[PDB]
């Protein structure tokens, strides 16, 4: 924590580069983490992969990209807001650009010999005592600008969060209560699918280990899992493909379908052999 | 912990060697540990051993090597990032290379008698009081460069982690949900195989000790292990060989196979006698 503490290099053309790096790089890392952790980017990638023909129209891809970027940008925005409200980065970056002519609150004692160097050295307390008033005059100005920018950022972000939702409810063909039900269903489906995938994988692995050694060393909960849930085989690759991708609220016979797993279960999702272990049986014969 | 504390030798052509050693050697050790602990390097070695003919193509070997190196390089990268953000190693290494002409923030009081020696002696507080400003001028510069490099490293690493995953999902023939299921299966298979190997070895050892002494002194849990899981013999060497190596998602009759243990259990993996205890029975007769 003390490692990432801000340390302004008081040098012209050098402090703003350090501020830019030390502020943007954490923001970029948070943006990357937000992109990676989201599962909507991955099924968007899966759609672009399996479609392989640019079949999807511009509107749905644009909507998904906007949603992913908006969900990811929460952490960079709040990090930037905190950094701006702190004021250290902005004063460090903009100390060297302060105009000596515009300086006030003291008689004109500011030298013009090396103006940029002294202005850049202000943050590190390396201010001559004869310019003790000027240093504070700049410190209260640049920090003010920093905090002003932070507050404007919070205002703009709040306005965007208000407007985006006000348009999302207005342009959606569904009611907001039905969309809340849909969100609840999506959360429950994701959690249940993950849990059952874990259990199914454990049971299959136990069967394989039993085939190898002749028995399996299982715990009591694992024994209950094996007894209650028996597995006969593995789901085919097309069955997995039928449930991976983006879904936009299709309706069948007046009844809503809330995911492509639901659509597949209803039966609305389901010659050439690929990535086979061995050749056709005719070739195996020879 | 205090043993590995950094101690800069303030001497020209000597401090950067110490910094290089004291930074790289921990990084090299962490890289070696990451390589060793991973089990993918070992089944890659097993493949190169049993194939013994360079049979594997360049693409799969390159992919496995890239994966192993990428997984191993996490600890060296974060260690280097922390060391760079600390700034001590970089300032110690680059103190002697600071150009006296480029020095500023003070009148030209820097001697040219032995410039390199004083510059190298800056880190150890052995700076003459007449150069007290120069020492700080260098301390805020070199440390800035160190921290800048650290932040650039974090940015590049984050970009690579984003791009590599974005390509891994794009070029993979499987969907991301199926790959998650595959990873869960691999973890469960590894844990179950280790546990059953331990239990099987314990039961076999108990049988041998019973053959020697006439009984075995077993604990209650060991008694349960012996009663529940009886062993009749040991698996042959080819049976072990059939499950050790690298596996790349073959598919049999439209059904996925997730490991070579699974492939062996399905029956798709299975004259000259090697490393025998005694000669052929014909030779034993004589």
């Amino acid at each position, epitope marked *: 924590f003390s490692v990432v503490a801000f340390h302004c290099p008081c040098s012209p053309a050098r402090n703003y580069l350090y501020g830019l790096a030390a502020i943007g790089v954490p923001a970029l890392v948070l943006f990357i983490i937000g992109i990676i952790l989201n599962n909507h980017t991955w099924n968007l990638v899966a759609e672009c992969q399996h479609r392989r023909t640019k079949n999807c129209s511009a509107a749905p891809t644009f909507l998904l990209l906007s949603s992913i970027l908006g969900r990811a940008a929460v952490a960079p925005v709040t990090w930037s807001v905190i950094s701006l409200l702190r004021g250290e980065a902005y004063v460090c970056a903009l100390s060297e650009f302060v105009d000596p002519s515009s300086l006030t609150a003291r008689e004109e004692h500011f030298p013009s010999a090396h103006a940029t160097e002294i202005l850049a050295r202000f943050p590190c307390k390396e201010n001559p005592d004869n310019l003790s008033d000027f240093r504070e005059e700049v410190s209260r100005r640049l920090r003010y600008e920093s905090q002003l920018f932070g507050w404007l950022l919070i205002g703009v972000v709040a306005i965007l969060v208000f407007l985006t939702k006000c348009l999302k409810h207005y342009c959606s063909p569904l009611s907001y209560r039905q969309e809340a039900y849909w969100a609840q269903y999506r959360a429950n489906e994701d959690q249940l699918f993950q849990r059952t995938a874990e259990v199914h994988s454990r049971v299959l692995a136990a069967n394989n280990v039993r085939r190898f050694f002749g028995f399996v060393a299982l715990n009591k909960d694992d024994e209950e899992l094996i007894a209650n849930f028996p597995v006969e085989g593995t789901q085919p690759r097309p069955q997995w493909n039928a449930i991976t991708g983006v879904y936009l609220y299709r309706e069948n016979q007046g009844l809503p379908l809330y995911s492509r797993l639901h659509k597949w279960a209803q039966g609305l999702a389901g010659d*050439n*052999v690929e*990535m086979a272990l061995l050749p056709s*049986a005719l*070739e195996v014969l020879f | 912990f205090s043993v590995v504390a950094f101690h800069c030798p303030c001497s020209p052509a000597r401090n950067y060697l110490y910094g290089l050693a004291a930074i790289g050697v921990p990084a090299l050790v962490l890289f070696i540990i990451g390589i060793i602990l991973n089990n993918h390097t070992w089944n890659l070695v097993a493949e190169c051993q049993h194939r013994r003919t360079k049979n594997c193509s360049a693409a799969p070997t390159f992919l496995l090597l890239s994966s192993i190196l990428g997984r191993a390089a996490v600890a060296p990268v974060t260690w280097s990032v922390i060391s760079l953000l600390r700034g001590e190693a970089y300032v110690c290494a680059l103190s002697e290379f600071v150009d006296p002409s480029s020095l500023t923030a003070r009148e030209e009081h820097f001697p040219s008698a032995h410039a390199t020696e004083i510059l190298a002696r800056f880190p150890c507080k052995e700076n003459p009081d007449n150069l007290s400003d120069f020492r700080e001028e260098v301390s805020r510069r070199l440390r800035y460069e160190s921290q800048l490099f650290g932040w650039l490293l974090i940015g590049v690493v984050a970009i690579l982690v984003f791009l590599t995953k974005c390509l891994k999902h794009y070029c993979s023939p499987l969907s991301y949900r199926q790959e998650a299921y595959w990873a869960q299966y691999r973890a469960n298979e590894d844990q179950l195989f280790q546990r059953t190997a331990e239990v099987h070895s314990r039961v076999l050892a108990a049988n041998n000790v019973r053959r020697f002494f006439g009984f075995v002194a077993l604990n209650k849990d060991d008694e349960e292990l012996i009663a529940n899981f009886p062993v009749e013999g040991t698996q042959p060497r080819p049976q072990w060989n059939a499950i050790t190596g690298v596996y790349l998602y*073959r598919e049999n009759q439209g059904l996925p196979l997730y490991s070579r243990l699974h492939k062996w259990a399905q029956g798709l993996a299975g004259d000259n006698v090697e490393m025998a205890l005694l000669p052929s029975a014909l030779e034993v007769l004589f």
Partner: nanobody
Amino acid sequence: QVQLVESGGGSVQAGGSLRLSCAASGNIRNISYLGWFRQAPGKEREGVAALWTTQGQTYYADSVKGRFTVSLDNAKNTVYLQMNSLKPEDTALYYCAAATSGQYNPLRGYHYNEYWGQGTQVTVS
């Protein structure tokens, strides 16, 4: 794209002769694997015979050598099989299968195309 029509099934006692035909319709240019398979309840599916259009050679199973034969009509693009010296062990479902080579890339595996057709052949005694 390619369909196989199989015919000739029936009930013949032991020692009889049967001629089963399989006609291919579609893109038969790329097919290099022509053969027949038999499967019975309670057991898996095995191949009686197959032939090579590309190379010319042929394989018969151990139970097929000297008993049953398979011929190909290139002009008709059809497969004919002659069951001679029928036995009660031949009561099984019979299929004719076609495969178009198969190219192995090391990273992904074997890829090809395969076709099938459902038929039966049961011997009373």
